[PDB]
Design a protein around this ligand. Structure first.
Ligand SMILES: *[C@@H]1O[C@H](CO)[C@@H](O)[C@H](O)[C@H]1NC(C)=O
Ligand SMILES: [Ca+2]
Ligand SMILES: [Ca+2]
Ligand SMILES: [Ca+2]
Ligand SMILES: [Ca+2]
Lengths: 49, 311, 98, 78, 49, 104, 78
């Protein structure tokens, strides 16, 4: 789950199959600005640390 | 036009006033800070100084600044004009007596400028706080988020109905006017100015002279000399001695007046919501102290209010 | 938020002055005797202790008060209004303030 | 694209408040805001300098050069 | 009261009669310095906010 | 600081350039402790500065295009004198006895 | 005010401790303390260059110009 220890999971450090479960929500760009804003739950691994 | 904003400022001059910290010690600083306005949200502060910015003895020029070099007004190009609280502030704009800066929080406000090898700084004790907008205590304006109304000091120099009074300068005591000359105190009067003198030697003498005058006293310490020059007026600073009579001469508009503006406030991450019988379970993972409030929609609101600082 | 306005002090050298009342909010005036102020140009007064500085200060509304202020209101029973959406038979939805 | 009636569109296409359409500050990076401005006159109570400056009459021939070239103090004026 | 919500009261934002109740007290200027030091109770509006 | 191989001059500074002693004019001599410090005076090995609180003390100087700095871990704290924990010398107040490093 | 004999008063009107009257540091902005001073002599063990700078005799003719002028290393001196 997002924000928890296992939010990001990979079978190996070189695995090509990555599981990611973060509340990644794309936000509307600010008026007149070319950018890709988004909201995401802080990494659960850094939280676990 | 630009000159229309300096029509009144052209009638005023910079002045030297007491500064609590001119680097390591108190001194009479040409850049003395008179006021710090820091009630805006996104760290915008307006600092009023004794120096004039954007004016030169010859007219208006935003690249030039004017400051007093003793009795003589000096006009120089703005060179490394800086404002510092706890870290360098970005300068937004400047106007006569006023500097608009984008400053981080801090315990002090430092203003200073360079003039060749000389350095003029003034550090005052003033708690500058960053005021975030909304329900999140962000520490820096975010790149993106929710656009909310906020209070900001506008970057515009134009007159928006706020004024300060400029008064005729008080007596400018200046001992450089007196010279022992032929063992007989001579009073040097700068061209176009008047020098008031007060001597209390055996021959008590006092008055206002418009020209070089020789008094009966033989020692400069026995006399006082004051420069009277009303060509240009000064703000009625609380650090300058008041003149005699009605010294009020005019009004100077306050630039960069506080205005309502739209500020971008942070948007906390979307909570994880779990549902149980008659129970709502929220997992909150904020980035900054985020306020969570709830209330029942029944006859008893039973409100809840708490700041969430960590998951 | 209030603003404290402080006019230029009256420095009386070799003499004394007296404070007078003025119609200013929270007006303060006090004469401090025995001052020997110094300016950039040296000692301002001649006498060593026969000098007085008259300090004045008063409270004003700050510039922010035009925008950043709280309004205190007395609240009495007023009126109740609603926006009503009505449809009947084959007539489409119509609404008005009532 | 068209701006609101109370706004001025710089050549860059960005809208600017009409009040700012002409003043001392270029409010848009292109600078086209002030390019088409027109210089203001000054009251007859102020001595207009030869190079186009304008200083109060009381400062004329006062012994201090107030214009950028000292016109107010040049022998041509007094 | 000083330092409280109503420390500064004005019938309207443009009135010319302002009520102010702060312990504004003039302090003696420091020796040899021309300045007007004063002490005052911090704004009760800022406190209230 | 204030000495050169040729004599005494408070505008001059001397430092070692390997085995060779170099003497230069003081150029942007600075002290920083989480923020720039105001220099009071310098004499020989000693630098006197008024520094705000910080976790580190950074000292350095320029020699033409070269920059020589040294940062050491040292907690610099502001110690207000009296019964109030002020963060910066006030403009006005009560004059109390305190301990200072003289600038002389 | 006028100061006791324990303190020196600068032409600026401000007073400075008498021990600071002449010590190479301008303690008053006007510099009245250091504006009037005199140089002191050096022991016989020290050489004096053309500018009057004193250097120990062990540094005389040692190949290094230990004073503003090269007199300590001048051929006329060594
Ligand atoms: C009234 O209801 C209809 C259908 O629900 C809707 O299309 C219409 O917009 C409503 N009126 C208003 C004012 O919202
Ligand atoms: Ca404009
Ligand atoms: Ca003139
Ligand atoms: Ca000295
Ligand atoms: Ca030698």
């Amino acid at each position: 789950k997002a924000g928890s220890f296992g939010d990001l999971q990979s079978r190996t450090s070189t695995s090509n199959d990555l599981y990611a479960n973060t509340n990644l929500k794309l936000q509307r760009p600010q008026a007149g600005i070319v950018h890709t804003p988004f909201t995401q739950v802080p990494s659960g691994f850094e939280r676990w640390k | 036009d630009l000159d229309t904003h300096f029509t009144q400022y052209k009638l005023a001059r910079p002045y030297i006033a007491d500064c609590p910290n001119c680097g390591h010690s108190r001194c009479d600083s040409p850049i003395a800070i008179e006021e710090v306005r820091g009630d805006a949200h996104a760290g915008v502060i307006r600092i009023q100084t004794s120096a004039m910015f954007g004016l030169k003895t010859d007219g208006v020029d935003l690249a030039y600044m004017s400051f007093m070099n003793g009795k003589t007004q000096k006009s120089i190009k703005i060179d490394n004009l800086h404002v510092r609280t706890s870290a360098p502030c970005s300068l937004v704009s400047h106007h006569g007596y006023y500097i608009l800066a984008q400053c981080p929080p801090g315990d002090t406000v430092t203003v200073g400028f360079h003039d060749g090898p000389n350095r003029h700084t003034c550090t005052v004790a003033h708690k500058v706080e960053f005021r975030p907008v909304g329900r999140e205590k962000y520490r820096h304006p975010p790149e993106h988020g929710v656009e909310l109304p906020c209070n900001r000091y506008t970057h515009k120099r134009a007159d928006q109905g706020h004024y300060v009074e400029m008064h005729q300068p008080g007596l400018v005591a200046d001992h450089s006017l007196l010279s022992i000359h032929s063992a007989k105190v001579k009073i040097t009067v700068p061209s176009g100015a008047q020098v008031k003198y007060y001597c209390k030697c055996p021959d008590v003498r006092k008055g206002i002279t418009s020209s070089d005058h020789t008094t009966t006293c033989t020692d400069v310490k026995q006399c006082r000399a004051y420069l009277i020059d009303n060509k240009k007026w000064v703000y009625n600073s609380g650090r300058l001695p008041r003149g005699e009579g009605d010294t009020f001469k005019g009004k100077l508009h306050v630039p960069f007046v506080p205005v309502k503006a739209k500020c971008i406030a942070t948007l906390a991450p979307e909570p994880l919501v779990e549902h149980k019988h008659r129970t709502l379970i929220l997992h909150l993972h904020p980035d900054h102290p985020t306020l969570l409030t709830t209330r029942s929609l029944g006859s008893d609101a039973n409100p809840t209010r708490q700041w969430i600082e960590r998951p | 938020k209030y603003k404290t306005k402080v006019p230029s002090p009256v420095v009386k050298c070799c003499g004394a002055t007296q404070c007078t009342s003025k119609p200013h909010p929270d007006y303060q005036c006090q004469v401090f005797s025995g001052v020997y102020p110094f300016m950039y140009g040296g000692a301002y007064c001649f006498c060593d202790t026969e000098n007085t500085q008259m300090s004045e200060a008063y409270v004003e509304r700050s510039e922010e008060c035009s925008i950043d202020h709280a309004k205190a209101y007395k609240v009495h029973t007023g009126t109740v209004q609603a926006m009503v959406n009505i449809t009947y038979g084959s007539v489409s939805w119509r609404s008005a303030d009532v | 694209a068209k701006c609101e009636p109370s706004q001025f569109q710089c050549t860059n296409g960005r809208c600017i408040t009409l009040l700012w359409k002409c003043d001392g500050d270029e409010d848009c990076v292109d600078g086209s805001d002030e390019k088409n401005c027109v210089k203001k006159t000054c009251a007859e109570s102020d001595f207009v300098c030869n190079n186009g400056q304008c200083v109060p009459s009381r400062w004329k021939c006062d012994g201090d050069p107030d214009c950028e070239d000292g016109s107010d103090e040049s022998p041509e004026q007094c």
